[PDB]
Design an enzyme around this catalytic site. Structure first.
Site, PDB file in Angstrom:
ATOM      1  N   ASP A   1      -3.506  -2.840  -7.061  1.00  0.00           N
ATOM      2  CA  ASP A   1      -4.396  -3.986  -7.194  1.00  0.00           C
ATOM      3  C   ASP A   1      -5.628  -3.605  -8.021  1.00  0.00           C
ATOM      4  O   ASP A   1      -6.660  -3.223  -7.474  1.00  0.00           O
ATOM      5  CB  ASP A   1      -4.752  -4.615  -5.842  1.00  0.00           C
ATOM      6  CG  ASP A   1      -5.407  -5.984  -5.979  1.00  0.00           C
ATOM      7  OD1 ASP A   1      -5.861  -6.306  -7.110  1.00  0.00           O
ATOM      8  OD2 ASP A   1      -5.446  -6.736  -4.969  1.00  0.00           O
TER       9      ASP A   1
ATOM     10  N   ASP B   1     -11.974  -2.493  -4.864  1.00  0.00           N
ATOM     11  CA  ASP B   1     -11.212  -3.189  -3.834  1.00  0.00           C
ATOM     12  C   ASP B   1     -10.264  -2.205  -3.142  1.00  0.00           C
ATOM     13  O   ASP B   1      -9.099  -2.515  -2.890  1.00  0.00           O
ATOM     14  CB  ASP B   1     -10.469  -4.394  -4.425  1.00  0.00           C
ATOM     15  CG  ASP B   1      -9.963  -5.409  -3.404  1.00  0.00           C
ATOM     16  OD1 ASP B   1     -10.318  -5.289  -2.219  1.00  0.00           O
ATOM     17  OD2 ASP B   1      -9.201  -6.317  -3.807  1.00  0.00           O
TER      18      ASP B   1
ATOM     19  N   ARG C   1      -4.556  -2.652   2.399  1.00  0.00           N
ATOM     20  CA  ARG C   1      -3.740  -3.772   1.951  1.00  0.00           C
ATOM     21  C   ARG C   1      -3.351  -3.614   0.477  1.00  0.00           C
ATOM     22  O   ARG C   1      -2.358  -4.203   0.047  1.00  0.00           O
ATOM     23  CB  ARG C   1      -4.467  -5.096   2.202  1.00  0.00           C
ATOM     24  CG  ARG C   1      -5.595  -5.387   1.227  1.00  0.00           C
ATOM     25  CD  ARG C   1      -6.356  -6.672   1.546  1.00  0.00           C
ATOM     26  NE  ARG C   1      -7.698  -6.365   2.018  1.00  0.00           N
ATOM     27  CZ  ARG C   1      -8.700  -5.978   1.237  1.00  0.00           C
ATOM     28  NH1 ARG C   1      -8.525  -5.885  -0.066  1.00  0.00           N
ATOM     29  NH2 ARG C   1      -9.870  -5.670   1.756  1.00  0.00           N
ATOM     30  N   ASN C   2      -4.126  -2.819  -0.279  1.00  0.00           N
ATOM     31  CA  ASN C   2      -3.935  -2.655  -1.713  1.00  0.00           C
ATOM     32  C   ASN C   2      -3.282  -1.320  -2.071  1.00  0.00           C
ATOM     33  O   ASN C   2      -3.248  -0.961  -3.247  1.00  0.00           O
ATOM     34  CB  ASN C   2      -5.261  -2.780  -2.467  1.00  0.00           C
ATOM     35  CG  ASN C   2      -5.744  -4.211  -2.536  1.00  0.00           C
ATOM     36  OD1 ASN C   2      -4.941  -5.145  -2.506  1.00  0.00           O
ATOM     37  ND2 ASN C   2      -7.050  -4.394  -2.633  1.00  0.00           N
TER      38      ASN C   2
HETATM   39  C1  LIG Z   1      -0.213  -8.774   1.677  1.00  0.00           C
HETATM   40  C2  LIG Z   1       1.203  -8.196   1.574  1.00  0.00           C
HETATM   41  C3  LIG Z   1       1.841  -8.523   0.211  1.00  0.00           C
HETATM   42  O1  LIG Z   1       1.589  -9.589  -0.357  1.00  0.00           O
HETATM   43  N1  LIG Z   1       2.684  -7.592  -0.289  1.00  0.00           N
HETATM   44  C4  LIG Z   1       3.043  -6.282   0.315  1.00  0.00           C
HETATM   45  C5  LIG Z   1       4.131  -5.672  -0.549  1.00  0.00           C
HETATM   46  C6  LIG Z   1       4.458  -6.671  -1.662  1.00  0.00           C
HETATM   47  N2  LIG Z   1       4.416  -5.958  -2.948  1.00  0.00           N
HETATM   48  N3  LIG Z   1       3.474  -6.093  -3.892  1.00  0.00           N
HETATM   49  C7  LIG Z   1       3.796  -5.252  -4.865  1.00  0.00           C
HETATM   50  C8  LIG Z   1       3.003  -5.138  -6.041  1.00  0.00           C
HETATM   51  C9  LIG Z   1       2.311  -5.057  -7.057  1.00  0.00           C
HETATM   52  C10 LIG Z   1       1.495  -4.930  -8.221  1.00  0.00           C
HETATM   53  C11 LIG Z   1       1.715  -5.653  -9.392  1.00  0.00           C
HETATM   54  C12 LIG Z   1       0.869  -5.473 -10.490  1.00  0.00           C
HETATM   55  O2  LIG Z   1       1.126  -6.204 -11.623  1.00  0.00           O
HETATM   56  C13 LIG Z   1       0.194  -6.136 -12.709  1.00  0.00           C
HETATM   57  C14 LIG Z   1      -0.195  -4.558 -10.407  1.00  0.00           C
HETATM   58  C15 LIG Z   1      -0.414  -3.830  -9.235  1.00  0.00           C
HETATM   59  O3  LIG Z   1      -1.439  -2.930  -9.088  1.00  0.00           O
HETATM   60  C16 LIG Z   1      -2.018  -2.373 -10.285  1.00  0.00           C
HETATM   61  C17 LIG Z   1       0.439  -4.028  -8.152  1.00  0.00           C
HETATM   62  C18 LIG Z   1       4.924  -4.585  -4.557  1.00  0.00           C
HETATM   63  C19 LIG Z   1       5.662  -3.636  -5.167  1.00  0.00           C
HETATM   64  N4  LIG Z   1       5.267  -3.199  -6.357  1.00  0.00           N
HETATM   65  N5  LIG Z   1       6.775  -3.127  -4.614  1.00  0.00           N
HETATM   66  C20 LIG Z   1       7.172  -3.595  -3.360  1.00  0.00           C
HETATM   67  N6  LIG Z   1       6.390  -4.571  -2.735  1.00  0.00           N
HETATM   68  C21 LIG Z   1       5.292  -5.039  -3.347  1.00  0.00           C
HETATM   69  C22 LIG Z   1       3.382  -7.750  -1.585  1.00  0.00           C
END
Ligand SMILES: */C=C\C(=O)N1CC[C@H](n2nc(C#Cc3cc(OC)cc(OC)c3)c3c(N)ncnc32)C1
Length: 298
Positions: free
Chosen positions: A178, A160, A164-165
């Site tokens: 992700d 994926d 976006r990820n």
């Molecule tokens: C579509 C946009 C959206 O929903 N976002 C953009 C930035 C926001 N955001 N998400 C994260 C994250 C994460 C995460 C958590 C996990 O838990 C097991 C595992 C991951 O990958 C292995 C990723 C985020 C972070 N970390 N910092 C600032 N903004 C973040 C959501």
């Protein structure tokens, strides 16, 4: 029932949850303060991100969150991989604590740095962002190739890979994220014979779409699409083409056109990533080497 993993377990009373960060790209993630999670500064309260289940979570969501956490332990530490900081797994809701990336996902990061008048351009905090330079876009691409080279060497397929990820830190470091669909593979192609159809079509290699197999070379295809996203400053791939029509067009050998911000060299790299025959695509190792050369010249 989740067995305790003491080295990763973080105390609930040292975690304070805050504002939601969005639910669309990485599930339900919330800003939080974690006291003493950074062992270099054990007194300090660090800003972190916490992934958790929504109130409408399914069984698959729970299993996916556990599996994602385990994958992050598996893959280990790298500059261009989002870092696991800890987890709350006992005596309460499952919380997975990851490093906070203040500049959001790459798609939003690039779109916010588009020039005014262009589609999706906006000023974060009502204040204009600094324009991306060519060097910045190449650097972005280099960092992600390095991350994927590391991921592949840990025998993991992402499945994926998309803008976006990708998460972007305060210091503009790219972090691959992700791992919802990621798998540990062996040396042979990943094949199930049972098709779930949970892969985003516009980023999928043909062999994933048609033959239901996945290798590191399938991720290389996706990386080509990611490159296109980067050089279009967060463009949506196959512009104007419905997902439904792409099955046919891929069989007919359709490929995306060159982005304007792209050199001929970098477009040929993209096109090489989109070879129909996986073994004719470059490896992540080769991509890193090529991008290293380009970057140090620019
Ligand atoms: C579509 C946009 C959206 O929903 N976002 C953009 C930035 C926001 N955001 N998400 C994260 C994250 C994460 C995460 C958590 C996990 O838990 C097991 C595992 C991951 O990958 C292995 C990723 C985020 C972070 N970390 N910092 C600032 N903004 C973040 C959501």
């Amino acid at each position: 029932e989740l067995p305790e993993d003491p080295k990763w377990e973080f105390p609930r009373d040292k975690l304070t949850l805050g504002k939601p960060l969005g639910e669309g790209c990485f599930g339900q993630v919330v800003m939080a303060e974690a006291v003493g999670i950074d062992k270099d500064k054990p007194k300090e309260a660090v800003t972190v991100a916490v992934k958790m289940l929504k109130d409408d979570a399914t069984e698959k969501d729970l299993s996916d969150l556990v599996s994602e956490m385990e994958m992050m332990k598996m893959i280990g530490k790298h500059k261009n991989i989002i870092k696991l900081l800890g987890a709350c797994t006992q005596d309460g809701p499952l919380y997975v604590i990851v490093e906070y990336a203040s500049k959001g996902n790459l798609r939003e990061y690039l779109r916010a740095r588009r020039p005014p008048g262009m589609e999706y351009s906006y000023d974060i905090n009502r204040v204009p962002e600094e324009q991306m330079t060519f060097k910045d876009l190449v650097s972005c691409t280099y960092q992600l190739a390095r991350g994927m080279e590391y991921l592949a060497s840990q025998k993991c397929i992402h499945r994926d890979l998309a803008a976006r990820n990708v998460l972007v830190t305060e210091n503009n470091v790219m972090k691959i994220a992700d791992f919802g669909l990621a798998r540990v593979i062996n040396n042979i192609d990943y094949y199930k014979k049972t098709t779930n159809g949970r892969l985003p079509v516009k980023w999928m290699a043909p062999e994933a779409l048609f033959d239901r197999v996945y290798t590191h070379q399938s991720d290389v295809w996706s990386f080509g699409v990611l490159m296109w996203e980067i050089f279009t400053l967060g463009g949506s791939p196959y512009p104007g083409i419905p997902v439904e029509e792409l099955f046919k067009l891929l069989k007919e050998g359709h490929r995306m056109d060159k982005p304007a911000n792209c050199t001929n060299e970098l477009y040929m790299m993209m096109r090489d990533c989109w070879h129909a025959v996986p073994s004719q695509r470059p490896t992540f190792k080769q991509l890193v080497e090529d991008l290293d050369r380009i970057l140090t010249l620019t």
